[PDB]
Design a protein around this nucleic acid. Structure first.
Ligand SMILES: [Mg+2]
Ligand SMILES: [Mg+2]
Ligand SMILES: [Mg+2]
Ligand SMILES: [Mg+2]
Ligand SMILES: [Mg+2]
Ligand SMILES: [Mg+2]
Ligand SMILES: [Mg+2]
Ligand SMILES: [Mg+2]
Ligand SMILES: [Mg+2]
Ligand SMILES: [Mg+2]
Ligand SMILES: [Mg+2]
Ligand SMILES: [Mg+2]
Ligand SMILES: [Mg+2]
Ligand SMILES: [Mg+2]
Ligand SMILES: [Mg+2]
Ligand SMILES: [Mg+2]
Ligand SMILES: [Mg+2]
Ligand SMILES: [Mg+2]
Ligand SMILES: [Mg+2]
Ligand SMILES: [Mg+2]
Ligand SMILES: [Mg+2]
Ligand SMILES: [Mg+2]
Ligand SMILES: [Mg+2]
Ligand SMILES: [Mg+2]
Ligand SMILES: [Mg+2]
Ligand SMILES: [Mg+2]
Ligand SMILES: [Mg+2]
Ligand SMILES: [Mg+2]
Ligand SMILES: [Mg+2]
Ligand SMILES: [Mg+2]
Ligand SMILES: [Mg+2]
Ligand SMILES: [Mg+2]
Ligand SMILES: [Mg+2]
Ligand code: NA
Ligand code: NA
Ligand code: NA
Ligand code: NA
Ligand code: NA
Lengths: 396, 221
RNA sequence: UAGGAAGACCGAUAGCGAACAAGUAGCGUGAGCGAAAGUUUGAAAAGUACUUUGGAAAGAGAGUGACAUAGAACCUGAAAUCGUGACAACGACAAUGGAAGUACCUUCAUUUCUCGGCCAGACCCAACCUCGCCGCGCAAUUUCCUUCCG
RNA sequence: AUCGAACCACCUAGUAGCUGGUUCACGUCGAAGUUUCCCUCAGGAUAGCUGGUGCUUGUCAAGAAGUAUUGUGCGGU
RNA sequence: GGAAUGAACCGCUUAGGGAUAUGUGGCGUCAAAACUUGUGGGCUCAUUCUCGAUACGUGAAAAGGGUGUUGGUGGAUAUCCACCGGCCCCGA
RNA sequence: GUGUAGCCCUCCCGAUGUAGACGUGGCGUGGGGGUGAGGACGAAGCCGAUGGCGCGAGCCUCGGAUGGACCCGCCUCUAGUGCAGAUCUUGGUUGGCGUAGCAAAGAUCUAACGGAAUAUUUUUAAAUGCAACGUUGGAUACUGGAGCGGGGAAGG
RNA sequence: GUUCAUAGCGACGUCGCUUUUUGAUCCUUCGAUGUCGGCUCUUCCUAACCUAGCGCCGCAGAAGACGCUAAGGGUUGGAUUGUUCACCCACUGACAGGGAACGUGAGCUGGGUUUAGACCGUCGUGAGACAGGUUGGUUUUACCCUACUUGGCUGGAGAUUGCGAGUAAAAGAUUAUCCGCGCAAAGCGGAGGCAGUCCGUUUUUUUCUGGGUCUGCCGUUGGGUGGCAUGUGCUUGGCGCU
RNA sequence: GUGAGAUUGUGAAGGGAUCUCGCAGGCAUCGUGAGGGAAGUAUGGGGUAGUACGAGAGGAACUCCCAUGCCGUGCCUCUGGUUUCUGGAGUUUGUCGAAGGGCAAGUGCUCCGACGCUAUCGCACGGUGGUUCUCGGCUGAACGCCUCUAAGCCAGAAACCAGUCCCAAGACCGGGUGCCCGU
RNA sequence: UCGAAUCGCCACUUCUCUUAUCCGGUGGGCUGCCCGCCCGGCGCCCAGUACCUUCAUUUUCACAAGAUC
């Protein structure tokens, strides 16, 4: 018999199975389509999530009710130390998919990069890349490198660079990992010869986020969400609870199938793992590209708020600490908890809407404490409200 | 299929360098799909090793729209309880040919499984089979012997492209390069072919006359 | 109540409920109900002194005895089920089964060893069964063949 | 711990046209669910189908035949 | 033993085994046989439950239509009209 | 000379089958009357990649690094005479399975002593002897006089 | 239907389809397949209510009628009743019709139906009866196999074995006997030397050995120039060291 | 051949014979993507416009702009909820002689309360190309006319397939790379 | 360590297209006919077609008792 009343099904069937992600780092599954007319450029970057705050800005949107008026928007702050390029890889196309051709490694690599290939670095022989270092710069080594680069020019299709983060420069007390995170970044634009020329110039050098992205641009976010362990159907899928008089519990699904077919189907909600899944979210605008506090301290000072302050709130980001390097301010939220590594990539969807092309001009940035109800923007403001306290009296 | 270290040491001890089993390479261009599979299936059961190339040029009788609808009806069949257990719908031309041959074999016995393992299918002519010798055809499954000229037929590559195959352009680019490379080399090596023909004609004038008379009687020269 | 004669009877789940501290132990307010259980080690207790580890129980030795794998509710000691050493292999058709071979075992039975009752091949006779090659009878072969003109 | 007639022993191995069971091998043969009567319709008796034992005979054929032919009757689909 | 599968359909009816030949049914692969037989004729093209293809097995189909194509019959004139079949299509 | 290890040799015709009938010098078990053997140089019983014989029920040999005192062939007589199932009877064994659980009445801690229950290592201390028990002192807490207080009847 | 059979209908007749009604039958189940409705949840069908695109009208516009491809998506909140059904109020783009053992009780609930108590009406001499009304009336067990959801360990191509040899690899004394450019071209470039030993069927034979040595290059002794996000490693430029 | 073992039923040396196993990989990283899943869907307002059309009555729509309903994926800066931080304060009965400090009332009770979790009760985001169906046409015969059909071609639905998105080599990747070992 | 089953190979085959198509290509004359023109290989017993020389007793079949990897 047909169901008495209709309602939409609970949950999206295209995100199955709801299992734990294989990796903890965000990895881009695809890269934007190559356009040979443009100049060669990188397409992704790796950052660390710090915390959230909110801002004030003026919007320009003809025909809207908020045109030329102030709004408040929450934002997310991500720390972005510069990356280091150490390798070059090339791909060729076959009737069964893409195949790697080879790899060109840099002559000098740091300890934090070589830490990744060991489970116990401080108690090992630390022999990684030692044989290659003894051979790469010799006459035979130079010939072998030219052979690989010749293969890239002749028969490659895609050019990518191997890069890693610098956890040493990101001197965070709570991020415990000391081995760098390694990923691949595709090079788009130009011919194959021009792509290789850019990669060679980038070998063994630092790349800053301001050379990849621009302010008032959108980006895509790849990250793994927060975990919740074993979870029931009510939270995992959003089904409705049962009446109060229900024997044997009410947080369940009443009927999990008909008599025929004589089995449970894959479309029925069940209890299991919730959270810790890889997701890719679209169209996140970039509100600010800040620089390291050591160079310019007035990070959170706008043309309308002349107070000199940094981006770190009073008392620090809860569970993270201070932001000491370059950073990016994204509108809205991103997946994952604080301290997790997140990958940003250039947009996939077309960017031609009025919302996507709007120019952003910040007016106010909040730096009050996130512990409790912060009501002071700066330390000096708090010490002006209170006079000299008892401890200060002791000092004087 | 990649040799292990154990195989390498054994071959080195016994001084073995290379080995090629007896394999027949079939060019499947302009062949009827059903009739080619039936002939190939029987020869496999008799213990032959067969490699087929250019699977994207197989032909099926009927208009393309009729055959496209036929495949879409097959794509609709799936296990409702768990589609990851249901029938698998392969999309490449070489996978379509292998499925067709598998349906003409005792696939649920070890004898049938062994026979299927003896067949290798390719799109185009890959680089590892180009120099292996002359290719063969099956006269009983050729298009010009099977179809009336006025009927309409379908090329397997064009049908697969519109139901999910993603490498039609890749195969087309590879085929263009192979024709260019092989054509250049065959334009070369013509001076040697002409020289060999001239030497045979120069013979019959220096060779003994009695043997020349025998060759004429048997219609060889 | 004392004794006798016996049996084509049963042989410890049988024969009386009872081959034994059996109308007992146990059950029910009561009238009443009511079992299991061969002490069958050895001819003879000669029923394991003594050394050593262990709190003990026991273990490792030693000794009695023809036999201790006859050590104490101890003749014989089956099946179901389980442990261990060695070996045989085996995807996913639930296993089991039938037919016909083969690969490794087994050393069970029989035969032979200067003739063999073993294994092959070719040849001869009879019988049965095939193939090549050569033919015949019949107005079946005249609703036909040929020449010419209209 | 028992009540639209307690409990115990005995008549009592109460009767059941109804349900369940019924332990070695090979060989020669081999069915019926139809007729009549029965308070008969989930059962019997009775004829038919079958097996065993034969008796009296014959040997190419008596009192043979799910078949023809010839002759002579019957019939209302 | 055959009709893929089926108490009753088709063939044939049965001691343990060889050789030879058939019955029903078959000879593209599954699967033995035309390694796709003939030095035989015609007819048919059928877009989402996908043209058709072993009787019993209705175990899938009608009335009514088609200037699809392929054959006849009866009339007119140096091609036209009326009617009847075969396969296919709509009705489905 | 019906019936066999068929007295022997040729020849012809049938051979399936539920319920059911009948035949068999057909097989097997306990005991009686006869006849003939076997056994401590090892009977019955039990074990088996021990083979041979029979269409079959079965029979016989071999091995036991099993057993320790009885037993069988043939002709006849006799019967409490042959098991896979009866929600069958009485014993034993079994997957499930080291599983379900052992969750009302609030609760224990510490030092010393006792105890075989330790402070147990050969191949510095922790990472190689865990866990748990009674008494005494101290701490904490419960019953809260309709009491886990002190006395009796019935019953034991 | 102002006329006009066929925009939209269509009597008298006649040919079908469906199994969402109810009958007809009695094939399976009586050593038991839990019997109405609602709640919850998933999926399928199309005879299309809304959403996409079209043809046609007795389509001027607006609102509509009829038909075609199309089942991807959507299809409500309440009063009364145990109700399915029914009937009203309100919102909406729309409040379509159905199946899955008349889906779904080891998922719930127990209002109804259908035990035992009791009252009424009618019937019966009576015990009692009623597909008439009424009130009250235990809803048991998952730790097994599979299915589904998550979670880990681990072999394997003769899918465990054979030694049973197939590259979406290169391009040559049969891949051996050097590299770079070049079209599987034409053609053009570069390469340290000396002594022993040990083995050897020739073409300047293979190795192993020893010094003398010259680039590229390590690890170094220090020194100064510098770049990078600035405690850590690089580029320089010499020293003596393989 | 070589290195390990074994030959366990009625005793101990010694020798032999035979049977089994091993004789080559290991660890760590960056990737590919066959196959399977699959998602966004509707309404309103501005403007077009009191316009087209209509005698009047009346009365539309597309590009474009701005919001919202249902659904989906996440997040905790703000707002709200939650307190066994028994955090700070207050207050009742009993109790340690009073005060102080506490404690018992299975968290005595009241107020405020961080971190965390959480709500369309808060906040952010939700793409690109093809093959076709119905239908409308272009050339064009059959049939010296005509005809969107017979051959051929064009445009083209929320339908179908692929891209983006999720799992991903029992899909056995002769894809790449680092170091140790062996030959 | 291994005793094994398989018994053509090539740097002349190892490029492409067509079958309503000059079946190697390609012209002319008057529908179809006539007339023109140019251009798979080795391997099977003397490393080569001369007739020089070793084969045994492995004494009548037996996996080729020999090769290849
Ligand atoms: Mg519905
Ligand atoms: Mg309840
Ligand atoms: Mg906060
Ligand atoms: Mg007794
Ligand atoms: Mg005993
Ligand atoms: Mg009786
Ligand atoms: Mg019975
Ligand atoms: Mg008979
Ligand atoms: Mg009577
Ligand atoms: Mg065959
Ligand atoms: Mg019989
Ligand atoms: Mg019988
Ligand atoms: Mg007796
Ligand atoms: Mg008896
Ligand atoms: Mg028994
Ligand atoms: Mg437990
Ligand atoms: Mg409990
Ligand atoms: Mg209390
Ligand atoms: Mg108290
Ligand atoms: Mg039953
Ligand atoms: Mg039941
Ligand atoms: Mg049930
Ligand atoms: Mg129904
Ligand atoms: Mg139901
Ligand atoms: Mg229930
Ligand atoms: Mg119910
Ligand atoms: Mg149920
Ligand atoms: Mg009631
Ligand atoms: Mg896909
Ligand atoms: Mg799909
Ligand atoms: Mg307290
Ligand atoms: Mg107290
Ligand atoms: Mg509060
Ligand atoms: Na309950
Ligand atoms: Na008794
Ligand atoms: Na009966
Ligand atoms: Na008391
Ligand atoms: Na329809």
């Amino acid at each position: 018999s047909h169901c008495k009343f209709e309602h939409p099904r609970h949950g999206h069937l295209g995100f199955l199975p709801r299992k734990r992600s294989r990796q903890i780092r965000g990895r881009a599954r695809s890269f934007p389509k190559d356009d040979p007319s443009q100049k060669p450029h990188l397409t992704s970057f790796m950052v660390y999530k710090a915390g959230m705050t909110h801002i004030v800005r003026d919007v320009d949107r003809p025909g809207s009710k908020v045109n030329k008026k102030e709004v408040v928007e929450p934002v997310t702050i991500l720390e972005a130390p510069p990356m280091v390029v150490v390798g070059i890889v090339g791909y060729r196309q076959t009737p069964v998919g893409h195949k790697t051709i080879g790899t060109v490694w840099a002559h000098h690599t740091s300890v934090e990069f070589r830490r990744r290939f060991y489970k116990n670095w401080k108690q090992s022989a630390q022999l990684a890349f030692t044989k290659r270092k003894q051979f790469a710069r010799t006459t035979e080594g130079r010939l072998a490198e030219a052979r690989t680069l010749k293969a890239f020019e002749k028969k490659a299709d895609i050019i990518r660079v191997v890069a890693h983060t610098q956890l040493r420069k990101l001197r965070n007390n709570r991020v415990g990992v000391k081995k760098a995170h390694v990923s691949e970044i595709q090079i788009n634009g130009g011919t194959i010869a021009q792509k290789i020329e850019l990669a060679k110039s980038l070998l063994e050098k630092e790349v800053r986020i301001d050379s990849v992205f621009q302010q008032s641009e959108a980006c895509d976010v790849c990250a793994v969400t927060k975990g919740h362990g074993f979870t029931g159907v009510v939270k995992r899928w959003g089904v409705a609870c049962l009446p109060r008089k229900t024997h044997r519990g009410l947080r369940k699904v009443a009927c999990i199938g008909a008599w025929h077919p004589s089995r449970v189907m894959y479309t029925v909600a069940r209890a299991g793992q919730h959270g810790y899944h890889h997701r890719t979210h679209l169209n996140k605008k970039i509100y600010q590209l800040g620089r390291a506090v050591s160079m310019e301290p007035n990070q959170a000072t706008t043309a309308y708020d002349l107070t000199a302050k940094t981006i770190t709130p009073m008392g620090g980001f809860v569970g993270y600490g201070t932001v000491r390097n370059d950073y990016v301010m994204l509108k809205g939220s991103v997946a994952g908890p604080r301290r997790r590594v997140i990958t940003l990539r250039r947009p996939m969807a077309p960017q031609t809407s009025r919302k996507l092309t709007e120019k952003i001009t910040l007016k106010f940035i909040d730096t009050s404490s996130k512990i409790g109800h912060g009501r002071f923007q700066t330390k000096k403001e708090k010490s002006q409200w209170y006079g000299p306290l008892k401890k200060d009296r002791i000092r004087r | 299929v990649l040799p292990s270290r154990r195989s390498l040491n054994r071959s080195s001890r016994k001084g073995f360098k290379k080995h090629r089993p007896d394999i027949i390479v079939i060019d499947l261009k302009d062949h009827v799909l059903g009739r080619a599979a039936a002939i190939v299936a029987k020869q496999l059961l008799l213990g032959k090793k067969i490699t087929v190339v250019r699977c994207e040029k197989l032909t099926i009788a009927g208009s393309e729209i009729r055959n496209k609808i036929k495949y879409l009806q097959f794509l609709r069949k799936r296990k409702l309880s768990n589609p990851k257990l249901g029938p698998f719908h392969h999309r490449s031309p070489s996978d379509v040919f292998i499925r067709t041959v598998r349906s003409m074999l005792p696939r649920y016995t070890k004898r049938g499984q062994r026979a299927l393992r003896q067949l290798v299918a390719y799109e185009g002519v890959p680089v590892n089979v180009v120099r292996t010798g002359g290719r063969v055809v099956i006269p009983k499954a050729q298009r010009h012997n099977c179809y009336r000229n006025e009927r309409r037929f379908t090329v397997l590559g064009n049908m697969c492209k519109h139901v999910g195959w993603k490498y039609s352009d890749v195969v087309e680019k590879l085929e263009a390069a192979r024709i260019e490379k092989s054509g250049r080399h065959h334009k070369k090596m013509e001076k040697v072919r002409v020289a060999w023909k001239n030497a045979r004609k120069e013979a019959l004038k220096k060779m003994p006359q009695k043997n020349v008379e025998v060759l004429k009687k048997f219609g060889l020269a």
